[PDB]
Symmetry: C2
Subunit: 318 residues, 2 copies
């Protein structure tokens, strides 16, 4: 069982992981906070490669299309695809519903296209605080509906998967439930849910992680959530917190999390409810992993990304 | 692996278990609501085997003592003990903090005394709504302190375990945390947590179970909680909801639950956090089991009780 308590004890963490985490904490002791200087200001700087983590290099083979969003705006979709796709991976980026972009993780999309043979489609959904809930989910639902309708003609295949990191793992679960409830679609083959947020009312580990700046502090969660949900929304509503939804008829899922993530309980709890609803689920727990650990160098990141590639192969008939 | 989705699907439930559950619903439907005829009235009904559960015959070996409680009242303890005990089982009965008694489960105490060789001590704690929080926990804490101090003299051993059902599983966890935090005691060998309640803010499964009267309905959980917590208490406080506490340095635990229990998420979530804190935990999931299923005949009850007996033997060195 992936729920081995030894994985959660200090001696399970490698010296490599400890060192990576220490550098990350010390690096961001001065990175200004977006709620102090402005979300758009932080966004523009990050897109230029200023501040924050390194900006991953973009792929030359990426192409962009636009689809119609609810209310008449355009929702861009970024496509990185092999010659003869074996399926599609609908990817939703993270960033607390406030930051990030569809073009800030091309190496990961290239990895999945190469190692699982999938056409990758990453969604440029609207961001808070400018566009709070339900704008983000509305755009991800529009992308999933577009893919259900157009995947065969665009990619030659109707084998679909979904996934994303942190807020993107949240939005992946919200989208799966909306496709089932609003459209009667239950045909996704798998969900790659990478340290997702599933309880917007704050699970136990979120509340006590504290404010040591290992990627995601308790205060970060609070500020992101307030930007996404500024209007007195019920934070246990199932469209806001998928942990509270009825999870019947969901696809097989892979849940990935590190043991030093404020969102550890979100993954463990969502994994439990996914199984309790009769769905297949795989769990990968990585000792010492920070929130966001899959983007860093080192062994636990490599192993977690390899587990994701193997899962995506398995659910797409490979 | 106990966390197998197949156990949660309808075809895993045996005909025997389905027939048991049908009778159980009809038996509970014949009982008036305690908030409509009085808690005292239902306590009396429950004591005559007319409150849904069967009448449990009392043991001839049982003896009762009284210890000093916080504030001067007396807390009765019911003792069923073999001649040369291998340890002690501190037992805390269930009943939604409102119902039940120390003398309504003698067959279970006799089973543990005989099969695990433990002296059993069952706590007669004060009940809501007349004595709301923290009266019940205060009495369980007093019992545990008395047992640590007096176990060697009374029973010839200092090997201790703790356990209980439903609200009794809640109180067992509350007691373990108080003993660690206030009293420095980390000596319990094991915790037998039988379908416990651990989140008084109501976990997802509690909210959606509904009001078909398979032992414990959503409405029952709501009414029990309000009687126990009538003074505006924060229901995510860690002394009220152990799911929110820091779980370091806890004993090995056995978590038992049936798949048709409103409290299924409480067990799965508490199990997850128990392991995530670096503690040993064992999980038993029983297909089709109602809340309270161990009290009713049939294979799954026998199997679950056998798993508890084996756990208690293991943690006491046998």
């Amino acid at each position: 069982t992936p729920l081995d308590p030894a994985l959660f004890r200090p001696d399970a963490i490698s010296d490599e992981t400890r060192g990576i985490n220490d550098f990350i904490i010390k690096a961001f002791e001065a990175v200004p906070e977006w709620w102090e200087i402005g979300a758009a200001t932080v966004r523009e700087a990050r897109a230029r490669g200023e501040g924050g983590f390194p900006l991953p290099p973009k792929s030359e083979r990426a192409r962009t299309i636009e689809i119609e969003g609810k209310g008449g705006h355009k929702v861009p979709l970024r496509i990185i695809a092999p010659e003869s796709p074996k399926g599609v991976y609908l990817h939703i980026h993270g960033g607390g519903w406030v930051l990030g972009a569809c073009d800030q993780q091309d190496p990961m999309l290239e990895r999945i296209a190469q190692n699982a043979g999938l056409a990758c489609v990453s969604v440029e959904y609207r961001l808070a605080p400018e566009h709070p809930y339900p704008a983000g989910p509305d755009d991800c639902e529009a992308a999933a509906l577009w893919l259900v309708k157009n995947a065969k003609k665009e990619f030659g295949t109707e084998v679909l998967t979904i996934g994303g990191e942190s807020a993107g793992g949240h939005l992946s679960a919200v989208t799966l439930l909306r496709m089932r409830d609003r459209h009667g679609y239950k045909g996704f083959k798998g969900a790659n849910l990478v340290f997702g947020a599933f309880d917007m009312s704050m699970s136990p580990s979120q509340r006590v992680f504290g404010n040591e700046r290992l990627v995601l502090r308790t205060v970060d969660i609070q500020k992101f959530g307030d930007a996404f949900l500024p209007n007195g929304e019920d934070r246990r509503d199932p469209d806001i917190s998928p942990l509270y939804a009825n999870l019947h008829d969901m696809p097989p899922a892979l849940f990935t999390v590190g043991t030093r993530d404020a969102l550890v309980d979100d993954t463990l709890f969502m994994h439990a409810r996914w199984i309790a609803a009769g769905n297949e689920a795989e769990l990968g727990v990585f000792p010492g992993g920070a929130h966001g650990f899959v983007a860093f160098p080192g062994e636990i990141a490599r192993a977690a990304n390899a587990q994701a590639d193997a899962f995506l192969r398995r659910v797409t008939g490979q």
